[PDB]
Every structure is written in structure tokens, then in C-alpha cells.
């Protein structure tokens, strides 16, 4: 007996949706669900999604509490939808994928996996469900999860991070850390090596290497010369040039960062969603220096350095492609006499 | 000559309803209020209640701007509605109540609280304002406030704290602090011996102890042994348990400032209102400990340890009914061997 | 080629609109623009405007992205639209202006500022745009900024700040002060001499003089012993006096910041635009002194000290008119017995 009043009791007394019976009074109007409590009206959820509001509502109440990988992850892996839970994408406040499986009677297209209208759609799989490896042996497009080895398959070890009801975090009383497979047309694919963006932000970043805490602490000058940097235009790369009205560089979040400790400045996310690489509008309060397109990457500061100091500088200009969260990015790579001109993610 | 256009011309130059003549030109779209101010339009009112826009836009403006309980307290004393004025309710951004009397042609049930239809219904009464006390003794259901005695009444002294325009406060400028009284079926009831919850936030505490700046600045182990607390599970109950999956304890809101102020966490408002027990869908940045439905109550540190300290430890397990806010708040008790396994407000 | 589907080409490849073809898919629902990317809807721009949904997005779109006049000014200059550009107000996140003027088809009142229905309109132009200058000099009604001299024409010094994407900044990379000239009825008009608020914020309040810093660093009767500033009732106007119900006083920017830095306080911004004179419904949340309508101006408080040292202390009561950002604002005097008892911009 499922139904938008059974939803909403879950709701309300359980935090989420968990299959207990019962009903609430629930009032639907402009896009927002409500209930009473003692004779007034109380706001249970605001749709932002596209979606009809009580379908979003039962989606949201239904959403995976258990860390998950992040959506830019599973997007790089071609997910088009999940095995019988709703992976909800907090970025966006909406279901990370359009239809569902054994969910909700208005977005399912099947009610289980093996249904053959899932055997075109790379369906997501979670080891940590019952039968759920089995079902990925058995589907024709799919990606699996798992904690520990899966037998005969050969396993791609994931982000340290996973995303825990929108937060992102390495586990420590939990588990985020999972073996990633995935199958093409029946056929298991080999996942490629790759680096793994670090999904930090800007307000609250903290460094994860000495490297990192060196950057944050010392001066431009004398990190360059610590690390042996010279030639790889950092000062333009990663901490940025404000002195022109085209802002210069800043294409690493650890150097958005280091300048937003000193003066604050403005990024406008105008495709507000999860991915590998961001694309910012940025403005600098302090000199006035801007860029409408800022993109922008969270590596790991030791791993942009082992990166950048394995190009050929001997191109004027060249296209140089790396593996990051399972995807091919693109990189611009600019050099003059044997030096780094500029070095960012092509646009 | 009450209307839409005389609204706004108080809103803009008063900074509220004040009763003063006068109309300026309105706009609505969108469940929004707008003005012209020379020749554009600028937002005055995004009605968020269930209501018509333009009705809860007048309720908005008469809403009462001196100190007043906080709806915690109102609903737990049983108010139905007010008399002759708006208790506005900043914590869902909308009136307290669904009716109103002698306020809004739209909402209005009556001109005066005498009237027949108010009987059955506990009204609201304000000592503050003129003719009310006597309103409230021909009243059959009623609370009524005041700052200072009442000939013949009994009074219950109320908390220290109230509400002046969201603001929760205890006054210096101003009294917050009223004696209670209640009518019911036409006879004046005893209040119950209770305590008060303290109404503080998370980003925002503040101490107001001996016993909790002994909390926040010493460790658990130093302050457990001082205020010979051994045997009551404050590790679990108040400072939380953060080692596991399903986050363990953590009940007053002063253990969860502690974390906090480390730390940070998520908590997930589910149903958000104003009551005295809350309940919070928690997630541990740092651990990845969560809880669904983590039920959390600001009570002053020393009343929470004179509770837990009265109960009976013999027995495994009790329900135990504390006055707070003056309703019977229901804990489980939990004990094995003399001491105390768990001591939370009942789910 | 324009149309919607272009715009959103724009904003998701370029930040704004940058007159690139291409088209991207799209879909209108509850005042949202979203886009597709990879088979889920993504918000684009959500309407806070009265204007139609697609209207507003393109006005966004084509947003000036250079330093820009502060709204307060274009509107105290008397701007009722701007030749071939949007003054995007990032307070009321709607268009400075109504009708556009080579812009958006649905906005347009013409395509040129030479077009007669523009004649009775003061035009704003920007002499940074080529051809711009001629055009103010053939318009019949009209402001004018530049960074240099116009032959001929007798300048006004405009403020050190300006708007840069809703960002108010004295630019260092970028040039933010402009000469300003104005033209009504096909005559220059010669400009008042004026002071200019500073533009600043409560949270992020820096100190831009010797006297501004010690005003936050010294105590209340050593400042002003120190500035000489006996009987101008400092104390009153822009310290503020917490100790009544009503709150008294408190009409500089300034004042405010130094408060909030030692408790924090509530300002309800009920006119949330951009103005010269800002009025606030306050309440202090140490104390619960609180008033409906306060005005406050930032003035550096330099120039608050000197308009108040040049006025006559020998009346009771006195209007007081000031030219603020081009605007004349009028102050009530209050004075007993040679002193000054209150002086604040006038409701």
C-alpha cells in the first residue's frame, strides 16, 4: 500500500522513507508538500526538481542513505540508472538519474533488473545488497560496487571519498572506500588508471600531504623553489595573476583557497552540478580582476605536480589528456623556449 | 478602510502594520508581494505559508512586534489562537495559528474574543494589553500573560526567555520574563512544576553555568570525575558516540555545540518548527556516523543532571515523564548492573 | 538568430551571453530555466523578476560585465534606461530598468538611443563603448561616464567605487572611477558638489581613515574626547543607545559594525534595494532594544564628523539638506541648549 500519505508518515517518524505503515495528512501546494502537526501546516519538502512534486517527494524520502559514490563518479562511468534505490544528487536537489527500478510506480521502467527493457541502460549495482554482484553477472551494461573482492573479477580501486546523505567524506565508522567494475555489452571492461579529483571546498579546504601544507603556509617564492618549480608557471597556474583585468590561471582549488584566506572573492556556478572538472565566474573584490570561464580542479597538489612535470616542453602548444575519475580531461598545455606558459583544462 | 494598497503603505513606512493612512501601488505574482519604487519593482513579501499570498502578507504585517512566548510554549499550553493580534511564527514563516480574531477580515472568526464562537477555543490573552486580563476571566478557554500579579490568580512563573521579531532573548531593554495562566471548560487550572528548555542554536551557544563552561572547556574524562558523574553514560548520552555506523547518544544540544565547535556535522531539520523536544537526521563529517532520527532537547547542563540523577538504576528498563515547557516529555531509561546504558527523549 | 536556446548556448559555454551560435536544449518550468546536460535537467537561472521567465533570463544574460555605477546613483541621477546594455540589480536580482534599447525583443523601446520615442528618457551611456560619448552629446535627455575628459564638456568626479558582477569594489586591475555628465532637456546640466556613501557592509566593515580606525578601536569617550567631539551626541547618533525598549539612535554604517563585532544583531532589510539612505527594522538581540524603522547611511565617518561640526546649534529644531551620491538628503536637527540632542537622515 504505497501512497503519498504512507510517504510522509515515514517521513516524519523515521527521517527518510523505511517501509513502516501509517499515514499523515499531507497538503500539496506550489511545489511543496506539507503536514499537519497540531492543526498547522508544516513544509516536509520544496521540489527543485522537474519532476511532479509528489513523485520528487517519494524519490527524496527513498534516497540511498548509505555513503554512495559521488554523482561526477558515476556520471564518468556512463550510470544511466540504479538497481532499487533512488541515488540523490545533492548538488542539484534531484534524482541523479531521470528513471527508476523497483522505486516508485511513476519513474520505474521495470521492477527489477533483468527486466529487458534494462539491458540497453548501464545500470548501477551495490555489493553491499544481496544478490545485487549476481545480478550485475547476469546484466548486459552496468557498474558494480563492492568493499572486497568479487571472484574471478578483476577490481579498480575507487576514491578514498563517497558521499554519505550529500556529505563527502572518508569514512572512518563506515566504509567509503569500494572496488568499481563495470560491463559493455556483456563484455567486463577494463577501467583505465586514474587519478582521483578530492571534491574539497572552498570555504572549509584542509590539506592532505606536506606538500599541501607547505603551499598554504610558505610564500610563492620559496614553495617554488622548495619543490623545484621553476619553469612550470605555477605563480600563473595555481596562485593565480590579478594583476590584469582578465584574471590569469587559478585552475587549482588549493590556490583558490590559499587567496580566499587573505580576500574574499566571488565564484558564480552557473552549471551548478557534480563534475570533475567546475567552471566558475569569478571576480576578485579586492583588484577587480575577473574571468567569465574559471575552470577549476580539485587534485591533489602532489599529484598536478607529478602530472605537469611529465610534459614535453619542447611544444609550443599541445593537447595533453589525463585519466581523472575515471574520464579522459583534456588540458591545454602552452610552452615557450623549454618553459610552462599556461597549463589548464581545455574549454 | 482596510486593504492590500494600505498594507503596503505600512510596510514601507513604518516597517510593519502601525495603523497610519495612506496606499502605495502593489504587485502580485509568484505567491510575492512588490511595490513600485521609482518605476521598478522591488520585493516586499514571499508568502511561504499556506495561505493566499495577500492574506498572509496582511498577517505578516500585523504580526506582533513586542516580546511574546515562544510557540514552543503556546502549543504546548494548548493556544488555539490569539486575541487581537498575529503570533508570527519565524520558524516556518507563518502564523501560529490558523484563525484570528479581530485582525483580518480573510482569517478573522470574530471582532472579540466574547464572541460565542470563541468559547470552545483556548485564546491567547496579553495582560499587556488594556481590557485583556478581564477578557481572559469571562473567558471559558484561555492562556493569558502578564508581567506582573493578578488579584486572586495563582500564577506559574514562565521561562526567562521570549521572542521579539524572531528573536529569542532574555531582555534587558524590555521584560521577557511573564507569569502563565490557564482556563479550561471555564476554571482556572494549576500549571505544573516544569522545566524550561533554553532555546540556544549550535553556531551561536553560549554557556550560562558553572557546570557548562566546565563542559565546553574541559575534557569528558576531567569533567565526568568532577561532577562525580560515573555510572550515568555521559559519554554516550551527551558527548555521542561517534565509533560506529549508527551514531550513538548525543541528546543535549550542549554535547553536540562541544562536537561542533571541533568538528562539523549535519543536521537535517525534518520537520521544521518550533517544539521543545527536536529531531535531527544527523551526519558526522568527520567519522561518517550517522542517525536517522536523532532526538535533541537544550536543556540548562545542571537541570539535565539533576533528572538523570533522581532516577531509579535498578531496574532495566523504565519510561520515565519529565514537565519541560510545561508538557510531559516521556524518556527511556536504560540501565544494566546499577548504571546507566542509554537515557534519551522517547521516539 | 536570437532566441532562447541561443542564450542558454551562451551562459553554459561562455558565463553570460557573448554572441557565439549555438543552441543548447531546454526546458521552462516554475520561473526556471533548466538545460539538459547528459540526460538530466540542470538550473540555468531561476526568475526573481516581474518579467516572463525567458525574458529575464536573456536580460541576465547580457548583464554588463564591466565596472558599472551603482544602481543608487543611476537612480539619484534620474536613469530611466541604459543604450544597448542591462544594468543588471544584483539587490533585487531583477533589471535596473524596464524597457531595453538594442537588447532583448521583448524589452526593446528601440534599437538606437537616436530613435525619438528615447528623446523624453534620460539615456544612460558609457563612453567606454565606442560611438557612445556622440550619442550623449545628440541626446535630448541623458547621463554620461567616462574614464577621461570629453572635450568641451565641464566633469563631475564620480565615486571611487563601482559594481563589477554585483561585486562593489575600488578597482585596482580595473578602473572604477568615472566622470559623470548629464543632460536634461537637450541642456548640460552642471552637477552638485557631493559627498558618497561608501557602499560597504556589515559583516565585512573596513576601516578607510585614521579617524574610522580609532572609532573601532577606541572606547566611546576616549574617541571622542580624542576628536573633539563633545556635544554632538555621538553617543546617541552613532553609538546607538540599548538601554529603552525603543532603540536609540544609530544612523552611521559604522556604528553598527562596531556593535555587531562584540553581539550580533537583526537587520530586517524590509525595502531590499539599492538606496543612499537604507532603512532597517533592528532588534538587539543582547539587550531587546529594537526599532521599526532605522536609517542608516554609510558616510566615512570623516564626513559625518564634518557635516555635523559645520551646523548652527542654536535652533531646537532644524531640517538640514545634504547632497549625498548626487541626491539631496534631508537630516533632522535636534538641538537644546547649544548642543546637539539628535540628528538622523529624515523619515
Redesign the interface.
Same mark, same amino acid.
Given at each position: 500500500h504505497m501512497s503519498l500519505e504512507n510517504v510522509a508518515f515515514n517521513?516524519?517518524?523515521? *527521517?527518510?522513507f %523505511?517501509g513502516q505503515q501509517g499515514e499523515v495528512p499531507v497538503?500539496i &501546494?506550489?511545489?511543496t508538500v506539507?503536514t499537519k502537526?497540531?492543526?498547522? %501546516?508544516? =513544509?516536509?519538502f520544496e521540489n527543485? !526538481?522537474?519532476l511532479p512534486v509528489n513523485v520528487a517527494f517519494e524519490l527524496w524520502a527513498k534516497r540511498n &542513505?548509505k555513503?554512495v559514490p559521488e554523482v561526477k563518479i558515476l556520471?564518468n562511468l556512463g550510470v %544511466?540508472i540504479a538497481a532499487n534505490t533512488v541515488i540523490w544528487?545533492y548538488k542539484?536537489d534531484?534524482?541523479?538519474? &531521470?528513471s527508476t527500478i523497483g522505486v516508485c510506480s511513476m519513474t520505474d521502467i521495470a521492477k527489477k533488473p533483468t527486466e529487458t527493457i534494462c539491458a540497453p541502460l548501464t545500470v548501477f549495482f551495490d555489493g553491499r545488497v544481496d544478490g545485487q554482484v549476481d545480478l550485475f553477472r547476469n546484466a548486459r551494461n552496468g557498474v558494480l560496487i563492492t568493499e572486497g573482492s568479487v571472484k574471478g573479477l578483476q577490481p579498480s580501486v575507487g576514491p578514498k571519498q563517497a558521499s554519505?546523505? *550529500?556529505?563527502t567524506?572518508i *569514512?572512518?565508522?563506515?566504509k567509503?572506500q569500494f572496488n568499481y567494475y563495470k560491463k559493455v555489452d556483456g563484455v567486463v571492461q577494463q577501467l583505465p588508471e586514474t587519478y582521483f579529483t578530492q571534491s574539497r571546498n572552498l570555504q #572549509?579546504f584542509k590539506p592532505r600531504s606536506q606538500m599541501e601544507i607547505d603551499f598554504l603556509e610558505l610564500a610563492m617564492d620559496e614553495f617554488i623553489e622548495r619543490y623545484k618549480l621553476e619553469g612550470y608557471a605555477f605563480e600563473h597556474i595555481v596562485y593565480g595573476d590579478?594583476?590584469?583585468?582578465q584574471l590569469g590561471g587559478l585552475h587549482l582549488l588549493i590556490g583558490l583557497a590559499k587567496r580566499f584566506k587573505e580576500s574574499?572573492f #566571488?565564484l =558564480?556556478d552557473? &552549471?551548478?552540478?557534480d563534475s570533475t572538472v567546475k567552471?566558475y565566474?569569478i !571576480? %576578485?573584490?579586492? !583588484?577587480?580582476?575577473?574571468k567569465?570561464?574559471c575552470s577549476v580542479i580539485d587534485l591533489l597538489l602532489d599529484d598536478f605536480v607529478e602530472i605537469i612535470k611529465s610534459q614535453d616542453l619542447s611544444v609550443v602548444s599541445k593537447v595533453v589528456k589525463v585519466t581523472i575519475d575515471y574520464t579522459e580531461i583534456s588540458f591545454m598545455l602552452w610552452c615557450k623556449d623549454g618553459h610552462v606558459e599556461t597549463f589548464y583544462p581545455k574549454?
Open positions: 517521513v516524519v517518524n523515521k *527521517g527518510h %523505511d497538503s &501546494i506550489n511545489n506539507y502537526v497540531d492543526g498547522v %501546516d508544516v =513544509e516536509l527543485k !526538481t522537474t &542513505i555513503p556520471n %544511466d544528487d542539484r534531484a534524482p541523479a538519474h &531521470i554519505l546523505n *550529500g556529505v567524506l *569514512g572512518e565508522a563506515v567509503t #572549509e590579478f594583476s590584469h583585468s574574499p #566571488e =558564480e552557473f &552549471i551548478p552540478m567552471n565566474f !571576480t %576578485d573584490a579586492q !583588484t577587480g580582476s575577473s567569465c570561464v574549454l
